[PDB]
Amino acid sequence: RVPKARNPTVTYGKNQVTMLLYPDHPTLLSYRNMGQEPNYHEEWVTHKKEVTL
Amino acid sequence: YEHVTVIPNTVGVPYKTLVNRPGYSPMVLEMELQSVTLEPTLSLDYITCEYKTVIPSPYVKCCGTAECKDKSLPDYSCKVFTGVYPFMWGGAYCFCDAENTQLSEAHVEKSESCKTEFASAYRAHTASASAKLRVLYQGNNITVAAYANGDHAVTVKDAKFVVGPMSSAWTPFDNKIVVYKGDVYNMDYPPFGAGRPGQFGDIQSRTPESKDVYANTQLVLQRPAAGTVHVPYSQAPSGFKYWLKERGASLQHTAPFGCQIATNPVRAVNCAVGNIPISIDIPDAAFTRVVDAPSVTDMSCEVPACTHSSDFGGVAIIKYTASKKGKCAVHSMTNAVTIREADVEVEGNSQLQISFSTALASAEFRVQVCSTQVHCAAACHPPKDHIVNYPASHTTLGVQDISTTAMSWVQKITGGVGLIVAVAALILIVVLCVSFSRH
Ligand SMILES: *[C@@H]1O[C@H](CO)[C@@H](O)[C@H](O)[C@H]1NC(C)=O
Numbered sequence: 432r433v434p435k436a437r438n439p440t441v442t443y444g445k446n447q448v449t450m451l452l453y454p455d456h457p458t459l460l461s462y463r464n465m466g467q468e469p470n471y472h473e474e475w476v477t478h479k480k481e482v483t484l
Numbered sequence: 485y486e487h488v489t490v491i492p493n494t495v496g497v498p499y500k501t502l503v504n505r506p507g508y509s510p511m512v513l514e515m516e517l518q519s520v521t522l523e524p525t526l527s528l529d530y531i532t533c534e535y536k537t538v539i540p541s542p543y544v545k546c547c548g549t550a551e552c553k554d555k556s557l558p559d560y561s562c563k564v565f566t567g568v569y570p571f572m573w574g575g576a577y578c579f580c581d582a583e584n585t586q587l588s589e590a591h592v593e594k595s596e597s598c599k600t601e602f603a604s605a606y607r608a609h610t611a612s613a614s615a616k617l618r619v620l621y622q623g624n625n626i627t628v629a630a631y632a633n634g635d636h637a638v639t640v641k642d643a644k645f646v647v648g649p650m651s652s653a654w655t656p657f658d659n660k661i662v663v664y665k666g667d668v669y670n671m672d673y674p675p676f677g678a679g680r681p682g683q684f685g686d687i688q689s690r691t692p693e694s695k696d697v698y699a700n701t702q703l704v705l706q707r708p709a710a711g712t713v714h715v716p717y718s719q720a721p722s723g724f725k726y727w728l729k730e731r732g733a734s735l736q737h738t739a740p741f742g743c744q745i746a747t748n749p750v751r752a753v754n755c756a757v758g759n760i761p762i763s764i765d766i767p768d769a770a771f772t773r774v775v776d777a778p779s780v781t782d783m784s785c786e787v788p789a790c791t792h793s794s795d796f797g798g799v800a801i802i803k804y805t806a807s808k809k810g811k812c813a814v815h816s817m818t819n820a821v822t823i824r825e826a827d828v829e830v831e832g833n834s835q836l837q838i839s840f841s842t843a844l845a846s847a848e849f850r851v852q853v854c855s856t857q858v859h860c861a862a863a864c865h866p867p868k869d870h871i872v873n874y875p876a877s878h879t880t881l882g883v884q885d886i887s888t889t890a891m892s893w894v895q896k897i898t899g900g901v902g903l904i905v906a907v908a909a910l911i912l913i914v915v916l917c918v919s920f921s922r923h
């Protein structure tokens with residue numbers, strides 16, 4: 432058995448998404464584009480942090 | 485009656501088509517795609533797992549010289565050392581204080597755990613395809629399932645369906661793949677019989693039940709320490725353990741076009757590429773004659789609201805006068821506007837209501853209800869929400885779709901400039917003709 436993570440806070444803007452994360456222990460974040468070019472990215476998160484995409 | 489249509493490869497969006505047969509009332513069908521699956525053909529090459537080392541007890545011979553013979557076991561080694569003087573818990577082992585020797589040997593085998601923890605290498609070939617559909621037929625939902633090529637036919641309620649072939653041959657798998665407990669990787673594994681001492685493929689076998697094992701690890705025996713009985717050695721560590729700690733991201737998280745991956749059996753689902761043609765054969769008893777269907781004689785249209793969002797943001801009201809009670813179909817005559825409703829019930833003198841969605845800034849379109857047509861027009865506003873969680877239900881725009889006020893301004897500027905050229909040219913023609921005639 433493995434645990435599951437807490438919900439983040441999401442706000443909206445013109446062609447962008449802003450997220451605020453609340454980690455308790457190291458967690459992995461990843462995203463990709465759908466379509467012809469995936470543009471993969473990967474990052475480990477160990478403390479409170481804010482990101483824009 | 486045979487009918488042919490083309491449907492784009494998008495999941496979760498309904499589409500409609502019109503069937504028109506002379507002498508009969510028109511009919512409208514609705515179709516929606518639920519899943520598409522690809523499945524390749526696979527062949528096994530070899531498997532890998534962890535290894536074990538076997539060391540039997542040393543042989544100590546005092547006041548003499550020993551020797552060893554060759555054997556056929558994998559990675560076999562023997563060596564003889566001189567000048568040894570071993571001890572035990574009660575005192576020295578042998579009486580002689582010189583001319584003693586020691587013999588040591590070892591070889592490599594396959595671990596017992598290979599029946600549970602292993603990885604397998606495959607070679608892939610051309611894949612097949614399958615699809616499943618939902619069709620709205622005479623007021624009921626029916627489901628069909630078939631292969632996505634022209635070599636299969638199915639019959640449901642006396643209707644025959646044939647689907648495929650697909651427009652594209654794109655696949656997310658290469659020639660060489662590797663599978664381990666639900667993950668698929670693209671990797672160029674080394675040839676059989678050509679392994680490496682510290683990378684993937686040091687131990688190779690053809691099947692978990694086989695007895696032949698190939699090994700290419702390094703094994704060198706070293707000198708024992710003074711006063712001790714033991715068999716020391718040097719060897720490169722296992723390569724299978726190293727791969728597990730640094731294998732990286734799987735194919736599911738990196739593949740393009742939004743495909744999903746499953747492994748038992750290996751499949752890829754919901755890749756949005758290409759389009760799929762469809763053919764349907766409708767029997768004669770399903771049609772209704774034009775003389776039995778009701779007739780509608782007078783119409784008018786009004787549009788109280790429009791917002792060109794990604795959802796159904798329109799409403800329309802149409803007035804009609806009907807000759808008798810019955811059923812009727814509704815279908816749009818333009819490509820940029822889509823109408824949700826499929827049919828209506830008409831009686832007496834009343835009105836009906838519909839909904840539509842479009843991307844146009846200024847909306848003009850025609851609506852057909854039981855062989856007559858009406859003209860509608862209205863103006864539309866933009867929305868306020870920036871981001872949503874579902875795809876659009878309308879098609880894209882071209883260069884010809886421009887607001888009516890914008891087109892008016894283009895006409896005045898272009899026309900005005902052109903007149904100045906027109907008047908200037910007439911003066912030139914006259915002057916040359918006069919000069920020609922005077923001479
Ligand atoms: C379950 O165990 C059997 C042998 O005991 C093995 O063949 C199989 O791969 C195992 N499955 C998983 C998911 O570990």
Ligand SMILES: *[C@@H]1O[C@H](CO)[C@@H](O)[C@H](O)[C@H]1NC(C)=O
Nearest residue numbers: 516618620621623624625626
């Ligand atoms: C089944 O048909 C009804 C109309 O009678 C329709 O509203 C419904 O969406 C259909 N089922 C599905 C799963 O679409």
